[PDB]
Amino acid sequence: SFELPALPYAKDALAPHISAETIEYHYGKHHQTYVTNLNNLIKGTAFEGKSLEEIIRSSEGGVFNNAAQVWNHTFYWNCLAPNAGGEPTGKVAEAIAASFGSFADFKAQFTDAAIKNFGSGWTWLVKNSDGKLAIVSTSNAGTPLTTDATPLLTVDVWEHAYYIDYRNARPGYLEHFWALVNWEFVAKNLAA
Amino acid sequence: SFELPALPYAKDALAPHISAETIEYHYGKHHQTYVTNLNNLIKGTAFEGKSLEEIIRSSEGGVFNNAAQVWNHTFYWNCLAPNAGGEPTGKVAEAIAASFGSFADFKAQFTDAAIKNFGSGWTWLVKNSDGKLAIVSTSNAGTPLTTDATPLLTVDVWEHAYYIDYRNARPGYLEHFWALVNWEFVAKNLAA
Ligand SMILES: [Fe+2]
Ligand SMILES: [Fe+2]
């Protein structure tokens, strides 16, 4: 049975970049609704004895949509933190300069891909099978877990992620996303 | 060069069902941006000088996404009116009872399809090639104009359509949608 993971910080710790009101709806209502819907859709099926990741890799339709959204939002909350943001250091900055030239160029390309992701979706920094990093965008509940790439960083661009704080200005939301990035989480994902 | 069509009522005329603030962003920022983006993408191409419906039926990619969203939102604003709503009469009521058994059964099936439409999209009452009426949901900018069915009525279920007024409660939005339906516009589309 799946439970909503506790949030890694206080609901107002990401302010002013993401308000406490966005967390109360996005985590308290949207992420909770996907957990409840997944639990009710899998009760009594063979999916009930699988890990979340195996459910994402072996389902379709409603089960997939809710299971991938439960995982995608837990990953997303961990990519954000108070007193973080800025430019990365260590193995992460190395790997970013290696695949994208510099941090300024990666930041440009990720922002651009997130702004152009039409409709509801997610834009990801992934490490491919071959070790090079790439920027991938998915639509709706799509996730890199259905491929051989390893997820490193994500930004939710479903309109509920930013409409309370930024209304139609998804560019304003992405500018402020950079002030919250938890580079420690990214570094752990890169080393796995 | 396409122009944003004027709204056929004042900005505050759907209140309290859809607020003046929601149409200030949805019409004044979102629908306007689709027209500006479409004009920028077709300038100097063979699409310039074609009508909006011909562009929708013959393109794909960003040209399609923006052209179809311009048409979809103008159709949506024409589907809503002050001093309307309630149950249809006449020809529309007869066709709805003939394909769905009753107006209550149609309203319940349209509300169900609209709430379940995952992600961004639109839910439509269409008149099929054989004269029967059906409910179809599309994703992102998808529209029945790319098929053989005639659009009669639509509801926008992109989150920007309701998030200011209803936050995550898309059921509440749909309940209030029914108080705004302009059955004179549905009647014009039915015998088209
Ligand atoms: Fe989300
Ligand atoms: Fe819209």
UniProtKB/Swiss-Prot annotation, chains A, B:
Binds 1 Fe cation per subunit. The modification N6-acetyllysine is found at K50. One of its GO terms (molecular function) is metal ion binding. Its cofactor is Fe cation. Destroys superoxide anion radicals which are normally produced within the cells and which are toxic to biological systems. Homodimer. Gene3D superfamilies: Fe,Mn superoxide dismutase (SOD) domain (1.10.287.990), Iron/manganese superoxide dismutase, C-terminal domain (3.55.40.20). This is Superoxide dismutase [Fe]. Keywords: Acetylation, Iron, Metal-binding, Oxidoreductase. It comes from Escherichia coli O157:H7. It holds the Pfam family Sod_Fe_C. Belongs to the iron/manganese superoxide dismutase family. It is an enzyme of class 1 (oxidoreductase).
